Amino acid sequence: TNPVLDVDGNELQRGQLYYATSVMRPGGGLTLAAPKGSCPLNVAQAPFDEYSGRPLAFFPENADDDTVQEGSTLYIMFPEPTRCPQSTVWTFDREAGFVTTGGTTSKAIGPHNSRFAIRKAGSQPRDYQIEVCPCSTGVERPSCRMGCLGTLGLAEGGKNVLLNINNESPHTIRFVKV
Amino acid sequence: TNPVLDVDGNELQRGQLYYATSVMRPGGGLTLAAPKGSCPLNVAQAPFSGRPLAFFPENADDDTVQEGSTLYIMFPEPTRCPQSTVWTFDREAGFVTTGGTTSKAIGPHNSRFAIRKAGDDYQIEVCPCSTGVERPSCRMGCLGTLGLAEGGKNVLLNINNESPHTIRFVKV
Structure with a gap:
């Protein structure tokens, strides 16, 4: 299919570092947050003054893909150490309704x-959204058939803006290579 | 304050990928391995390339890995285990986990x-006390150099000073 592209048109290399800049730009990139001494960290939107947030890297579930393909399932992480012992791999906590x-x-x-999975939003530039898709796709092995939970949107949380399922108001983003 | 250098001779940059290839060549790189369906994974040796590594100086402003400055080490890739891939040495069984x-x-x-040369890179020390950082820090010298440990299904990393597993760094 169609790879995902950065602001520079280049493809999304597997494992390389990219910032998830907010399209709706009075807004910051993505980072990790929890109150002092709370674990685990959740995925959160930085305050506005941090346009880039922290770097992410993507890992297509299909091993021969070395670019990220639209609609195909992958893993996401902040490849940095953290004050908490859990992996920095994103997972959707279905009880809490956000990404942890x-x-x-x-x-x-x-x-x-x-x-x-990542998908285009809209015509051009290169805007995308992230979908929560429990069933593998773009993967040449048996996969469960049900659809995705839906699209990540910004979620007013109190101390932080988190990512929940919001199909009408998805958080659209661009990728800026690092 | 001597910067650690890859094989191409440039300084290790903050959190970029570098294989940890072996000097003595009956073996090669490093990776994570654990018994089937067990967690967490341990840092293990691959006895012929490996999985890449990033380095993270405690001093938030150090971009270049200085020699002897404490840092964090991790495998910045996903894993079948829910623990971060950051290395840690709990002295329960002596294995880097x-x-x-x-x-x-x-x-x-x-x-x-920390990373010290083997003699004018090269080895890795368990230094529980922070060095090369602004903040307060305890005074203990490093606990010793890391090296190989066998007897079971995989070669691990425990503390063994008279046999320090030497390595060089290969930027990806």
């Missing part, structure tokens, strides 16, 4: 909450 | 490592 850490790879046919 | 954390503790912290 401690995610895992999985090859199984069962749905898995660390599986995300 | 995963699930490390940053810390500004003044006390010792299990995930603090």
Whole structure:
């Protein structure tokens, strides 16, 4: 299909570092947050003065893909150390309704909450959204058939802006290579 | 304050990928391995390339890995295990494991490592006390150099000073 592209038109290399800049730009990139001494960290939108947030890297579930493909499932992480011991791999906590850490790879046919996909939003430039897709896709192995949970939007949280499922108001983003 | 250098001779940059290839060549790089369906994974040796590594100086402003400055070490890739891939040395069984954390503790912290030359890179020390950082820090010298440990399904990293596993760094 169609790869995802950065602001520079280049493809999204597997493992390289990219900032998730907010399209709706009075807004910051993505980072990790929790109150002092709380674990695990959740995925949160930085305050406005941090346009880039922290770097992310993407890992298509399909091993021969070395670019990220639209609609195909992948893993996401902040490849940095952290004050908490959980992995910085994104996973969708279905009880809490937002994205938290401690995610895992999985090859199984069962749905898995660390599986995300990226899709275009809109015509051009290169805007995208992130979908929560428990069932692998773009993957040449048995996969469960149900659809995605839906699209990540910004979620007013109190101390932080988090990412929940919001289909009408998705958080649209661009990728800026690092 | 001598910057650690890759094989191409440039200074290790903050959190970029570098294989940890072996000097003595009955073996090669480093990776994570654990018994089937067990967690967390341990840092293990691949005895012929490996999985890449990033380095993270405690001093938030150090971009270049200085020699002897404490840093965090991790495999910045996803994993079948829910622990972070940050290295940590809990001295329960002596094996470098995963699930490390940053810390500004003044006390010792299990995930603090350093890199010293083997003789005018090259080896890795478990230094629980922060060095080369602004903040308060305890005074202990490093606990010792890391090296190989066998007897089971995989070669791990425990503390063994008279046999320090030497390496050089290959920027990706």
